[PDB]
Amino acid sequence: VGALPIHWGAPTASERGPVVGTTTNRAHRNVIGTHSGSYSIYRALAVASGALSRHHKADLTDTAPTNIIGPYPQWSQPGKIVSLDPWGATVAEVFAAELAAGHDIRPSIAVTKAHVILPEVMEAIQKGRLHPDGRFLLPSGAALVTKAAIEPVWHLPGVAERFHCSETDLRRVLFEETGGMYPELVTRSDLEVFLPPIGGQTVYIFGDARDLADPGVELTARVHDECNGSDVFGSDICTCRPYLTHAIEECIQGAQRGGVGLVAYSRKEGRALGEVTKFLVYNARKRQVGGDTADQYFARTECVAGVQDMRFQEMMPDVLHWLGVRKIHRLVSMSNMKYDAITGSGIEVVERVDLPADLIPADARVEIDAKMAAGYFTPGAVPDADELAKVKGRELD
Amino acid sequence: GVGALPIHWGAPTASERGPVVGTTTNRAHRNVIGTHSGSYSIYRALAVASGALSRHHKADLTDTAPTNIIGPYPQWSQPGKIVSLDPWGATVAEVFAAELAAGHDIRPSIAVTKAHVILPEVMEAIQKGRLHPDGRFLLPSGAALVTKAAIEPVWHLPGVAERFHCSETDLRRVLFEETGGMYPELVTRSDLEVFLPPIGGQTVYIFGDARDLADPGVELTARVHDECNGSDVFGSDICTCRPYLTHAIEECIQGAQRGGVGLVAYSRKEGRALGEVTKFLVYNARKRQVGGDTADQYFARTECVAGVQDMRFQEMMPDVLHWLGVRKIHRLVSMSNMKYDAITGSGIEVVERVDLPADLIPADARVEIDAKMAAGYFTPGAVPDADELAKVKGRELDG
Numbered sequence: 001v002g003a004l005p006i007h008w009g010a011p012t013a014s015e016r017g018p019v020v021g022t023t024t025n026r027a028h029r030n031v032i033g034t035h036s037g038s039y040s041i042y043r044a045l046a047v048a049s050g051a052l053s054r055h056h057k058a059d060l061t062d063t064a065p066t067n068i069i070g071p072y073p074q075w076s077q078p079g080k081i082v083s084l085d086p087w088g089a090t091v092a093e094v095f096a097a098e099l100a101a102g103h104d105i106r107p108s109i110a111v112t113k114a115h116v117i118l119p120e121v122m123e124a125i126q127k128g129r130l131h132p133d134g135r136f137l138l139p140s141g142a143a144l145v146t147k148a149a150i151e152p153v154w155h156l157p158g159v160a161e162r163f164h165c166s167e168t169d170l171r172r173v174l175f176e177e178t179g180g181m182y183p184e185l186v187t188r189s190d191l192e193v194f195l196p197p198i199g200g201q202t203v204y205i206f207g208d209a210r211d212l213a214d215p216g217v218e219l220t221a222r223v224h225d226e227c228n229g230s231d232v233f234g235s236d237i238c239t240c241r242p243y244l245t246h247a248i249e250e251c252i253q254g255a256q257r258g259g260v261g262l263v264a265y266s267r268k269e270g271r272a273l274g275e276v277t278k279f280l281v282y283n284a285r286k287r288q289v290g291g292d293t294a295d296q297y298f299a300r301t302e303c304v305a306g307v308q309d310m311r312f313q314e315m316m317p318d319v320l321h322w323l324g325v326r327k328i329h330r331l332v333s334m335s336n337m338k339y340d341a342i343t344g345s346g347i348e349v350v351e352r353v354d355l356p357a358d359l360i361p362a363d364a365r366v367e368i369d370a371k372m373a374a375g376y377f378t379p380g381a382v383p384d385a386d387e388l389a390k391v392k393g394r395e396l397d
Numbered sequence: 398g399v400g401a402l403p404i405h406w407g408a409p410t411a412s413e414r415g416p417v418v419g420t421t422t423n424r425a426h427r428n429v430i431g432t433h434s435g436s437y438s439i440y441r442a443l444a445v446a447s448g449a450l451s452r453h454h455k456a457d458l459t460d461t462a463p464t465n466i467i468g469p470y471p472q473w474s475q476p477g478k479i480v481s482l483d484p485w486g487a488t489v490a491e492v493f494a495a496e497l498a499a500g501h502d503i504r505p506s507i508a509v510t511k512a513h514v515i516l517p518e519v520m521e522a523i524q525k526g527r528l529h530p531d532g533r534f535l536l537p538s539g540a541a542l543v544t545k546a547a548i549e550p551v552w553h554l555p556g557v558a559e560r561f562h563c564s565e566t567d568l569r570r571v572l573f574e575e576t577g578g579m580y581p582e583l584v585t586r587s588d589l590e591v592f593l594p595p596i597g598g599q600t601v602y603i604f605g606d607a608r609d610l611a612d613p614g615v616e617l618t619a620r621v622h623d624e625c626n627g628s629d630v631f632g633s634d635i636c637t638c639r640p641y642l643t644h645a646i647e648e649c650i651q652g653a654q655r656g657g658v659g660l661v662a663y664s665r666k667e668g669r670a671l672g673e674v675t676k677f678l679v680y681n682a683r684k685r686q687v688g689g690d691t692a693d694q695y696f697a698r699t700e701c702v703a704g705v706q707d708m709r710f711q712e713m714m715p716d717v718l719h720w721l722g723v724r725k726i727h728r729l730v731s732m733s734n735m736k737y738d739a740i741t742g743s744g745i746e747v748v749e750r751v752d753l754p755a756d757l758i759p760a761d762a763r764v765e766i767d768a769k770m771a772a773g774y775f776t777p778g779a780v781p782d783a784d785e786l787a788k789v790k791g792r793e794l795d796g
């Protein structure tokens with residue numbers, strides 16, 4: 001009849017206990033916050049307008065994962081996974097008794113399958129770079145994938161340790177810097193788990209999810225942070241979608257050669273500054289005295305945002321650990337921030353696959369040159385001060 | 398010091414309206430619930446906790462101003478017309494220059510810039526002769542020249558409540574309860590009317606001249622598209638989303654080329670605003686149910702998981718149109734009766750409705766679009782019957 005305890009990192013589901021973040025019975029709630037990231041606000045609108053009963057509980061029939069992921073040892077190693085719930089995809093199975101007992105437990109992960117058709121993959125086929133095999137890649141250009149949507153679930157003591165500050169400071173600052181969101185951050189130190197109203201990520205798996213846990217199977221992977229204006233709209237000011245679709249191409253070939261491929265797509269728009277800040281910086285970049293130069297790229301963000309980047313890649317490897325990933329043979333990525341995080345978490349990276357020069361869009365030179373000067377991996381020449389001062393950016397029109 | 402500046406929502410001028418002060422550098426100046434950047438205030442907090450970002454930092458807005466002048470328009474002050482974004486949010490540096498100088502730390506909630514967008518479907522449209530570069534709107538590279546505006550949410554709680562035909566205090570209590578107590582000020586600070594929710598906003602892509610949006614004598618082609626990452630980015634063939642998005646973009650480019658103007662609004666409402674986890678759960682149940690993935694079961698599968706078919710509440714979606722001065726949409730590249738009802742209900746005339754051509758429906762999206770048509774989505778001709786909707790049109794899992 002009371003709220004179930006949570007022992008983060010315990011080796012069984014029973015011992016770990018379920019994340020109860022629903023609101024149908026507040027005496028059962030054992031976390032701060034609520035499911036579905038931002039979309040709790042829309043659920044509130046649906047309740048307030050009469051469309052949805054505040055008493056509704058999901059019918060989870062037939063929703064269970066299409067592919068079995070874990071459990072793996074990483075799920076129970078202390079401090080290893082702190083920003084998602086390793087049991088979040090299998091709650092209907094591992095918490096069946098708690099559900100029947102009356103605890104309204106929602107999945108925070110869902111696993112299904114798809115056929116993804118990307119125009120860049122269809123072109124890769126037309127140009128003889130890819131050849132359909134009928135298993136991973138079809139003649140239509142469709143790739144067969146497993147995909148997993150993963151919503152955030154933060155163990156605040158683990159997150160604090162991840163960031164080298166005390167938990168009470170992390171929680172106080174979370175409370176203050178959001179204008180006082182969730183006073184239980186400072187008022188309920190007994191609650192260790194937080195469901196923030198932020199986007200999560202989506203994992204695309206090419207081949208067998210279980211091979212992600214076998215470091216003897218060659219793994220091609222990219223962690224991609226959302227860039228809507230490119231990932232969807234193809235703006236030529238940045239490398240994002242070209243890098244994403246190049247990685248997808250490489251992942252398909254990886255699977256075809258008998259390995260496995262992984263793309264994680266994490267919702268951190270604009271370096272987790274959001275899109276308004278991102279567009280303000282573009283304007284400042286193009287209007288500054290001297291033109292849009294690579295040697296001012298980072299400074300223009302700094303002046304608006306007070307920081308260069310807020311993605312905190314130190315939590316990004318949790319999804320890899322959830323998947324059992326223990327080694328990445330081909331990391332399709334250049335960022336030294338991502339590379340240090342992944343390898344700093346124990347995961348070997350064998351080959352770093354930089355973005356081929358011919359995929360850089362017409363107004364993305366400023367970005368990629370600044371990034372290589374800042375330490376992003378490249379096999380070739382790093383731009384020196386003189387090359388960074390070239391006005392490589394297009395004028396405002 | 399000075400107290401918090403009052404806010405008179407929908408006042409005739411920026412000065413009378415008052416700035417949205419949602420920063421945290423000075424708590425005494427805050428005059429709203431919440432903070433800027435939607436979801437991304439959580440990351441800002443992390444940056445401050447880690448010591449990477451000073452809690453005293455304030456934006457240098459030098460050179461950030463809109464690339465295109467949007468408004469002001471009468472709709473910015475019509476009662477209850479715009480309740481989910483701040484019409485002054487793009488121009489705070491100009492219209493609240495005084496208050497900034499009096500020490501009120503005021504951030505934009507809107508940014509307006511320009512871009513060259515290069516979509517593969519547009520390149521292919523050129524190869525097939527559906528589109529022809531003109532050098533001004535569409536380049537031979539396939540790049541289209543656009544103005545784009547990122548709009549983050551700013552809610553006037555009394556106006557939002559009215560829009561939903563419920564009392565303001567009921568709306569605010571339910572927002573508080575159903576989020577697990579997100580912002581107690583919702584129930585504790587009835588004097589604060591304005592709420593900055595931690596949700597995504599939208600991005601408007603304008604083909605041609607933004608000022609023409611306010612001129613109903615200029616032919617407007619428009620789509621309001623709700624985010625579907627798994628299609629809009631990854632092209633899953635279960636749904637129509639990216640085909641509809643890129644079809645609309647093609648139509649907007651052409652509209653601008655003929656002397657008109659185009660608009661695509663891209664709103665962050667993943668999975669009918671249920672989010673992506675619920676969306677994937679429903680796909681699984683669709684494909685495993687007795688009798689297979691059929692269109693007459695499509696909406697039932699969502700209701701069983703989510704308790705509703707849809708949470709996007711299109712009732713707030715026309716606000717951006719009114720912000721842009723749109724009074725008439727000559728070609729609405731959309732089918733949803735929910736969107737159409739909200740748009741016309743809000744006073745915007747719609748002339749032609751442009752359905753998704755049959756040949757752009759992906760291989761496993763037949764279930765979706767048939768169910769939508771049978772549910773009342775616009776279609777130029779016949780709607781499917783009880784039979785037809787009962788055909789197992791959906792691919793099996795793995796499949």
Ligand SMILES: O=c1ccn([C@H]2C[C@H](O)[C@@H](COP(=O)(O)OP(=O)(O)OP(=O)(O)O)O2)c(=O)[nH]1
Nearest residue numbers: 224225226227240268269270271278333334335
């Ligand atoms: O000028 C820019 C440059 C980058 N981004 C954002 C988008 C996202 O937050 C990330 C997109 O790409 P990716 O996910 O692949 O990250 P990265 O740091 O560029 O590393 P790499 O591509 O080497 O993996 O950068 C901007 O908003 N404005």
Ligand SMILES: O=c1ccn([C@H]2C[C@H](O)[C@@H](COP(=O)(O)OP(=O)(O)OP(=O)(O)O)O2)c(=O)[nH]1
Nearest residue numbers: 622623624625638666667668669676731732733
């Ligand atoms: O099976 C589905 C069907 C739809 N969506 C969501 C995604 C988003 O919430 C919207 C996709 O794009 P759009 O913005 O164009 O909405 P629509 O209702 O289909 O109306 P129309 O396309 O006719 O304008 O529907 C799902 O999550 N699963």
Ligand SMILES: [Zn+2]
Nearest residue numbers: 227230238240
């Ligand atoms: Zn980008």
Ligand SMILES: [Zn+2]
Nearest residue numbers: 625628636638
């Ligand atoms: Zn879709």
